[PDB]
Structure formats: structure tokens, C-alpha cells
Design an enzyme around this catalytic site. Structure first.
Site, PDB file in Angstrom:
ATOM      1  N   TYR A  66     -10.403   3.568  -2.182  1.00 22.60           N
ATOM      2  CA  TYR A  66     -10.422   2.545  -3.343  1.00 22.60           C
ATOM      3  C   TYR A  66     -11.815   2.763  -4.050  1.00 22.60           C
ATOM      4  O   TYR A  66     -12.102   2.210  -4.900  1.00 22.60           O
ATOM      5  CB  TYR A  66     -10.142   1.275  -2.933  1.00 22.60           C
ATOM      6  CG  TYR A  66      -8.496   1.021  -2.889  1.00 22.60           C
ATOM      7  CD1 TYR A  66      -7.911   1.719  -1.738  1.00 22.60           C
ATOM      8  CD2 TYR A  66      -7.588   0.686  -4.079  1.00 22.60           C
ATOM      9  CE1 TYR A  66      -6.573   1.451  -1.516  1.00 22.60           C
ATOM     10  CE2 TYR A  66      -6.184   0.553  -3.860  1.00 22.60           C
ATOM     11  CZ  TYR A  66      -5.650   1.056  -2.579  1.00 22.60           C
ATOM     12  OH  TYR A  66      -4.496   1.202  -2.469  1.00 22.60           O
ATOM     13  N   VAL A 101      -3.512  -0.982   6.333  1.00 21.94           N
ATOM     14  CA  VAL A 101      -3.985  -0.947   5.204  1.00 21.94           C
ATOM     15  C   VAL A 101      -5.375  -0.854   5.349  1.00 21.94           C
ATOM     16  O   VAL A 101      -6.154  -0.226   4.281  1.00 21.94           O
ATOM     17  CB  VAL A 101      -3.774  -2.401   4.522  1.00 21.94           C
ATOM     18  CG1 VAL A 101      -4.284  -2.605   3.280  1.00 21.94           C
ATOM     19  CG2 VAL A 101      -2.220  -2.525   4.421  1.00 21.94           C
ATOM     20  N   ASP A 127      16.608  10.055   4.392  1.00 17.19           N
ATOM     21  CA  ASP A 127      14.998   9.881   4.192  1.00 17.19           C
ATOM     22  C   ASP A 127      14.785  11.526   4.349  1.00 17.19           C
ATOM     23  O   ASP A 127      15.707  12.255   4.462  1.00 17.19           O
ATOM     24  CB  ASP A 127      14.408   8.965   5.186  1.00 17.19           C
ATOM     25  CG  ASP A 127      13.032   8.584   4.850  1.00 17.19           C
ATOM     26  OD1 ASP A 127      12.120   9.266   4.285  1.00 17.19           O
ATOM     27  OD2 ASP A 127      12.973   7.241   4.682  1.00 17.19           O
ATOM     28  N   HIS A 152       8.842   0.469  -5.869  1.00 15.67           N
ATOM     29  CA  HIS A 152       7.497   0.157  -6.342  1.00 15.67           C
ATOM     30  C   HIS A 152       6.408   1.199  -5.905  1.00 15.67           C
ATOM     31  O   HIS A 152       5.171   1.210  -6.273  1.00 15.67           O
ATOM     32  CB  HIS A 152       7.054  -1.244  -5.575  1.00 15.67           C
ATOM     33  CG  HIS A 152       6.768  -0.935  -4.187  1.00 15.67           C
ATOM     34  ND1 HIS A 152       5.858  -2.021  -3.303  1.00 15.67           N
ATOM     35  CD2 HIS A 152       7.472  -0.406  -3.043  1.00 15.67           C
ATOM     36  CE1 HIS A 152       5.887  -1.571  -1.993  1.00 15.67           C
ATOM     37  NE2 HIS A 152       6.817  -0.361  -1.770  1.00 15.67           N
ATOM     38  N   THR A 159     -10.091   5.466   6.148  1.00 12.74           N
ATOM     39  CA  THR A 159      -9.814   6.476   5.179  1.00 12.74           C
ATOM     40  C   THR A 159      -8.949   6.014   4.026  1.00 12.74           C
ATOM     41  O   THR A 159      -9.211   6.150   2.989  1.00 12.74           O
ATOM     42  CB  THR A 159      -9.245   7.800   5.660  1.00 12.74           C
ATOM     43  OG1 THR A 159     -10.118   8.186   6.720  1.00 12.74           O
ATOM     44  CG2 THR A 159      -8.863   8.823   4.904  1.00 12.74           C
ATOM     45  N   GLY A 185      15.801   6.316   1.304  1.00 13.25           N
ATOM     46  CA  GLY A 185      14.337   5.981   2.021  1.00 13.25           C
ATOM     47  C   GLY A 185      14.455   5.059   3.076  1.00 13.25           C
ATOM     48  O   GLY A 185      13.789   4.322   3.171  1.00 13.25           O
TER      49      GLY A 185
HETATM   50  N1  SAH Z   1      11.755  12.357  -1.760  1.00 10.81           N
HETATM   51  C1  SAH Z   1      12.316  11.757  -0.809  1.00 10.81           C
HETATM   52  N2  SAH Z   1      13.577  11.408  -0.445  1.00 10.81           N
HETATM   53  C2  SAH Z   1      13.940  10.767   0.335  1.00 10.81           C
HETATM   54  N3  SAH Z   1      13.152   9.662   0.992  1.00 10.81           N
HETATM   55  C3  SAH Z   1      11.785   9.663   0.641  1.00 10.81           C
HETATM   56  C4  SAH Z   1      11.100  10.472  -0.425  1.00 10.81           C
HETATM   57  N4  SAH Z   1       9.911  10.206  -0.653  1.00 10.81           N
HETATM   58  C5  SAH Z   1       9.653   9.297   0.150  1.00 10.81           C
HETATM   59  N5  SAH Z   1      10.724   9.105   0.854  1.00 10.81           N
HETATM   60  C6  SAH Z   1      10.679   7.635   1.842  1.00 10.81           C
HETATM   61  O1  SAH Z   1      10.648   6.373   1.326  1.00 10.81           O
HETATM   62  C7  SAH Z   1      10.080   5.303   2.230  1.00 10.81           C
HETATM   63  C8  SAH Z   1       9.271   4.459   1.624  1.00 10.81           C
HETATM   64  S1  SAH Z   1       8.551   3.194   2.635  1.00 10.81           S
HETATM   65  C9  SAH Z   1      10.123   1.891   2.772  1.00 10.81           C
HETATM   66  C10 SAH Z   1      11.110   2.517   3.885  1.00 10.81           C
HETATM   67  C11 SAH Z   1      12.053   1.612   4.447  1.00 10.81           C
HETATM   68  N6  SAH Z   1      13.282   1.438   3.098  1.00 10.81           N
HETATM   69  C12 SAH Z   1      11.834   0.385   4.698  1.00 10.81           C
HETATM   70  O2  SAH Z   1      12.059  -0.735   4.136  1.00 10.81           O
HETATM   71  O3  SAH Z   1      10.950   0.391   5.890  1.00 10.81           O
HETATM   72  C13 SAH Z   1       9.763   6.282   3.387  1.00 10.81           C
HETATM   73  O4  SAH Z   1      10.647   6.237   4.577  1.00 10.81           O
HETATM   74  C14 SAH Z   1       9.790   7.900   2.782  1.00 10.81           C
HETATM   75  O5  SAH Z   1       9.709   8.848   3.868  1.00 10.81           O
END
Ligand code: SAH
Ligand code: SAH
Ligand code: T3A
Ligand code: T3A
Lengths: 349, 349
Positions: free
Chosen positions: A124, A115, A216, A254, A119, A193
Site C-alpha cells: 500500500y 492482512v 477451483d 469482490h 509484504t 472458487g
Molecule cells: N480463474 C479462476 N478459476 C477458479 N477459481 C479461481 C480463479 N481465480 C481465483 N480463483 C479462486 O477464487 C477464490 C477466492 S477466495 C474465496 C474462496 C472461498 N469461496 C471461500 O469463501 O473461502 C480462491 O480459492 C481462488 O483460488
């Protein structure tokens, strides 16, 4: 009088203003403590550490020892160390700095580092430009591409992000796998994801008969190999999500505007309603509830909501979640507490 | 249990950690409010402003209106606006945001902008490198020269800094000129590090018979013209300070290490002890007093002390000030409150 007020009232207001102008020092001092490896040094010491022993381990120049003392006292007052005074001043860990100790159940030090990347956190400074952008995210303004494309081009960032996501994963994933109501009756699930499969592995370890697809972006899942009932699929959740009995969305929705969440939720609905099936979608994310949460918890959730400017994301309250679900054509939903800041939301097409 | 503790205890600690990781958002949101000119918009409106009227004036895209609302609610909760709800949500100023309104007795908006410059405030990501430097200041690490040399090469920064210094100048300078004990009996004074003469002008306006020398770096005083008893001298306070009955040091000594303060104080002593004279040195800076100040005031002073890493400076307590004065060969000293966070210290050679 000053500004139409008593000088004493002005002095109080000045103190508030300075607290906020200089709030970034809270962040920067915490980052420094982690970068200097101080929580681990103290843990390894096995007792509160004297200033002299601390600076000896750190090998700071003598001209900067007092600066270390000043920073340690500042951090202590914020709750990250306890000062114990005898022949010398010594520093003990607290529950909060125990969250920064490597090899704890909950070690969040990687989140501090990700966080507070110069960069990313520096982005922000551009809230004004961002607020004038019809479409761009705050990170889109400052990084010159979308965030997921940026991670694909910058491996050190991708690593930092993955480590940050991993840092609370055990706790959340264990809380999830202990929800039998989620998994009862499933033959398959797709973790949309799902990253490198961190969640899915815990699911498969718990439910060895369950088929799990980690879904993903291609670059995220390239070169990962599954085992027995766990497979990886590269794709785009905006285009097509593999069919399954259920979709999981952990820390997904989110990250997106309402409009983008609608698109995702439409693809999730499609995935769980193929060939006459009527499956479900399971969401892990915050639910803001000002009426029911403890005030301090509400305040952190509201802060996270502001922080999500990075991706034009949002931390939603129940009315906000409900409006999405209805517009996406789901019939009903249920919200349950899961762990800490997170809820488990199930929606039914 | 988690990390050897009850899950509820861990959740409380997590909330504290997140408050601090994300503290920089307090700074960044405040900066945004100032950059968007919101305090002035509300002042000019003459009543609390509705969200709809606010975004109309700002001409933000419709897709970012909710983001404005979220930021305004975050700032309001911090004390910078009051939310008033009737048919609509409206935002009123508070005493704290009245400090950001142009053309007030105390308008501190220029301080917000100078401190939160991306490059200056971004320097605080390098506390680790800085702590390992035997000699360098935090700004010396990040800017690639000393701060005063940097201002000389970067006019926009020099302007920002000057405006920030000017923003509380009227209040301090008026409190100073109302101290007859300072000026009684003086025939001359040199304002060492006196800038563009802001203080000296108020002094001369108050005491039209008093000779005042504004002493600062050549680049700072070049092209400034004095009048009757006010003159400008360019120089180096580490080398030679012009003779006078008294030296003033306003916001000088807190910018330097003890060792550098000793060098300055030696030159000041020389300036006020020429030709058998026994003058004095008058200092305006913070005095930390944990026993006597209100806790909130002590906390701001301690914060400022940490902030002074920028120049390897320090906000000193009375014992610290006394040790400097003794080592510099002054015989006795007196401390008086002056205004707000500042004290008036007189030392006698
Ligand atoms: N268009 C897309 N299709 C599939 N996955 C995507 C996407 N855009 C973003 N993501 C994925 O959404 C995730 C959000 S971060 C959350 C990751 C995981 N569920 C965890 O809890 O750790 C990332 O891994 C990112 O690569
Ligand atoms: N070597 C030096 N000799 C003289 N002045 C110096 C100096 N190094 C820094 N300064 C001056 O010290 C000042 C510190 S800022 C305080 C300025 C002024 N007294 C005010 O209250 O607004 C700057 O004007 C800076 O140029
Ligand atoms: O997400 S990024 O902004 O890094 C890259 C752009 C991704 N575009 C999508 C288009 O449907 C989602 O906006 C997914 O391919
Ligand atoms: O102050 S700066 O660091 O910008 C420039 C260096 C000034 N050097 C002094 C040497 O006596 C004080 O350190 C003053 O000329």
C-alpha cells in the site's frame, strides 16, 4: 494567525493530521498483541493479568517492560483490553480481543496476521504507481505476478491466506446452510472458487442428497479427495464452469473489476442454462447501503472497498451489482441479509 | 450466541477489529494524496476541483478514475477534503489539508513523507523482535545500525529527515525567540543537537549580541559556515559539550532512554557549571499531562510516545521529567507551554 487561521484551529488540524500519519501504529500494535499471544495468555490465566505476571510469562527483558506497559495501555484505550487497577494494573479481555482467542466460534487472529504481512500490507506504499497502471492490480505491481499465481509459488503465503479465509468460514457457511430458499429443489451445485471445499462440506453435511462440485484452480484442489456426493474439479472459471442446477460465488466477485466480473458471470450463466435448464447463481459478498446500514457498518464496508485495490476489486452497492447483472444478461435478482457484513444475492438468468 | 455473546455484540466487535486491522490504510491514503500532489493542485486551482478536472491534471488512466474517486471520498470522510456537489462532485481543501500545501506557514507534508517511508514505517512490523532486545532500538533492529549512523550513510534519508524536522521549525523557533525569560541576561548559548543551525539562526537574528554555538555530530555540521556570533562545533554530546551560559535541547531528550538522557544531562550540567558559573539548561519537548490537556491532545501525545519505539525514546509526563532532573543533580525546574504540542522546560543546576 497561522495559515490564515487562529493558532488554536491550526493545533486542532495538526492533531487530526498526526492521527492519520500515525494510524499505521493502530495496525502494528494489534499485530504485535497477536504475535506475542497476549489474548490467549489472558484467556488461559482465567482472570485479568497483572503487568508483572504478563511480562513474566512473555520473558521480556527488564529494559522493555515499560514498553510492554505502554503498548498495552495504547491497545486498551483502543478497546482491545480493559485496565483494572487495584494493588497493580491488570489487563482483561474485551469482546474485541475475545475475537483473537484460539478456539472460539469466531477467531479472527489469522486474518490479522495475513492482512498485516509486511509484504502484502507494505504494498500500500505503492498506491501512486498502481493508480498510473492501466491494468495492473496493486498486488500485481508489488509482487511481480498476479496474486493467485503468487500463492501457487509461495506455500507459506498460501497457508496464511487459507487460514484467513477459514477464520470466518463457520459463521458464514452455517448462515448459508440455514437458507432453505437457496437449496430447496436443487439436485446439484457448483461452488465456483470453492477453495479446499470448506463451504461444500457444510452444504453436503446439511443436504446429504445434494451433488456438490468444489471448483477451483488446479493447484488448489490437487490431491483433495471427495466423498459420496462431494467432488473436486480443477479449472479456470474464465474458461469453463461445470454444469449444475446452481452456482455459488462466496467471496469471489469482490476480487475482480466489473469487466472481469462480467466474464465470470457469463460463464456462470452458461453453467446454469445448459440443455434447456434454467438454474440460478447465488453470491455471498458485501452490499454497501448508505441509506439503510448503520453508519459504522457503512464505514467498514467503504474501508474494505478501498482495501480491495490489492486485486482491483470492489465492494459494491446495489446499483453497481444490478448494472453487472443486467449487462451479464440475468433477468432479475434478489438481495437478502446473511450475517454481519455479508449479504446473499440470487440472480436468475 | 457466538463467543458467549449476542450476534449483534459480535458484529460490533468485528467492526472495531476491522477498523484497527485496516488502520494502515488511513496512513497510506494520506501518503498517496501527498505523493500525487493533490493539496497543491487544489490550492493552485483556486476553487474546489471537479473529479474530471482532477483526473485530467493527474493524467491517470481511465480504468483508474473510479479508484481516484474512491480514495478521495475516503480522505474526505477523514477530514482532508470537503465534498461539494453540484453538476459534478468537487473537492475542496480543509484546514488539515491546508497543512499539506507548499509555502504555508505550517506545511507538514515533508513529515508525512519521512514518517511513511516504506523502510522506516515498515520497521513497526518488528515490534515483537524489538521487545525481546535488551538494548536495541526498533530502528536498530531493522536498519542494522543506529539511526544517526544510518542517516550518515544514506543521504536521501538524511535529507528526508532534515526536511521533516524543518517543517514545524519556524513555528517553534519563533515561539522560543519570543520567550524573553529564556534569553534575558545570556551572553552565550549552545544548541545541543542543533542540526544545521535552523534554531540558532533565528536566535541570532533576534539577539544579535548573543554568542550561539550550533553543536551536533561532525557529519551534520561539516562544511557549514557561521557568521559573526554564530559558529558550528562538531562533537558528541555524550563526551563533551562546549561551555556556555545555557544549553538548548530542542527535540533531543525524547529520542533517548532515561539512562541515555541522564548521560546527556550530566554533560549539559558540566557545560553550564564550568569555572564557578551557574547557568541553566532549556528543553523543548512534549510534556504529557492527562489531568490538564484536552483529551484529544493527550491521545496524540500518547501515540507519539508509542511511536518513539523507533529510538527507544519516550514522551514524558511531569513526574518522569522531574525524576530525570533530580537524578541528574539539577535543583529545580520550571515548565511553561510553548506552542501546540510542545512545552519549554528550564532546569537549574
Ligand atoms: N480463474 C479462476 N478459476 C477458479 N477459481 C479461481 C480463479 N481465480 C481465483 N480463483 C479462486 O477464487 C477464490 C477466492 S477466495 C474465496 C474462496 C472461498 N469461496 C471461500 O469463501 O473461502 C480462491 O480459492 C481462488 O483460488
Ligand atoms: N551524540 C550526539 N551528539 C550531538 N548530537 C547528536 C548526537 N546524537 C544525535 N544528535 C543529534 O540530535 C538531533 C536530534 S533531531 C533534533 C534536531 C534539532 N534540535 C531540531 O530541532 O531540528 C540531530 O540533529 C542529531 O544529529
Ligand atoms: O489471477 S492471476 O492474476 O494470479 C493470474 C492470471 C489469471 N488470468 C485469468 C485470465 O482469464 C483471469 O484474469 C484466468 O486464467
Ligand atoms: O546513535 S547511534 O545509535 O546512530 C550511533 C551510536 C552513538 N553512540 C553514543 C555512545 O555514547 C550514544 O549511544 C554516542 O556516540
Amino acid at each position: 494567525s497561522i495559515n490564515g487561521r487562529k493558532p488554536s484551529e491550526i493545533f486542532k488540524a495538526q492533531a487530526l493530521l498526526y492521527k492519520h500519519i500515525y494510524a499505521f501504529i493502530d495496525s502494528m500494535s494489534l499485530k504485535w498483541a497477536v504475535e506475542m499471544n497476549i489474548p490467549n495468555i489472558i484467556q488461559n490465566h482465567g482472570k485479568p493479568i497483572s503487568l508483572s505476571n504478563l511480562v513474566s510469562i512473555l520473558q521480556v527483558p527488564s529494559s522493555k517492560i515499560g514498553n510492554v506497559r505502554r503498548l498495552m495501555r495504547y491497545l486498551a484505550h483502543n478497546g482491545f483490553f480493559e485496565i483494572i487497577t487495584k494493588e497493580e494494573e491488570s489487563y482483561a479481555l474485551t469482546v474485541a480481543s475475545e475475537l483473537l482467542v484460539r478456539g472460539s466460534d469466531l477467531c479472527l487472529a489469522p486474518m490479522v496476521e495475513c492482512v498485516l504481512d509486511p509484504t502484502l500490507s507494505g504494498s500500500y506504499h505503492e498506491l501512486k504507481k498502481w493508480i498510473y497502471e492501466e491494468d495492473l492490480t496493486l498486488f500485481g505491481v508489488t509482487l511481480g505476478s498476479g496474486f493467485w499465481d503468487f500463492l501457487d509459488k509461495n506455500p507459506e503465503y498460501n497457508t496464511s491466506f487459507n487460514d484467513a479465509m477459514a477464520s470466518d468460514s463457520k459463521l458464514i457457511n452455517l448462515a448459508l446452510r440455514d437458507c432453505d430458499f437457496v437449496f430447496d429443489g436443487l439436485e446439484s451445485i457448483v461452488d465456483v472458487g470453492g477453495g479446499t471445499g470448506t463451504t461444500a462440506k457444510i452444504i453436503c453435511e446439511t443436504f446429504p442428497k445434494l451433488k456438490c462440485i468444489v471448483f477451483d484452480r488446479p493447484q488448489v484442489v490437487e490431491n483433495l479427495s471427495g466423498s459420496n456426493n462431494l467432488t473436486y474439479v480443477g479449472g479456470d472459471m474464465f474458461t469453463s464452469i461445470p454444469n449444475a442446477d446452481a452456482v455459488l460465488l462466496k467471496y469471489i466477485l469482490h476480487n475482480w473489476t466489473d469487466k472481469d466480473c462480467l466474464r465470470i458471470l457469463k460463464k456462470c450463466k452458461e453453467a446454469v442454462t445448459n440443455d434447456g435448464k434454467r438454474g440460478k447463481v447465488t453470491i455471498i459478498d458485501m452490499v454497501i447501503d448508505k441509506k439503510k446500514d448503520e453508519n459504522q457498518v457503512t464505514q467498514i464496508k467503504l474501508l474494505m472497498d478501498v482495501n480491495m485495490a490489492c486485486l482491483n476489486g470492489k465492494e459494491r452497492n446495489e446499483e453497481e451489482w444490478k448494472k453487472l447483472f443486467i449487462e451479464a444478461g440475468f433477468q432479475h435478482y434478489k438481495i437478502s441479509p446473511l450475517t454481519g457484513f455479508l449479504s446473499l444475492i440470487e440472480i436468475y438468468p
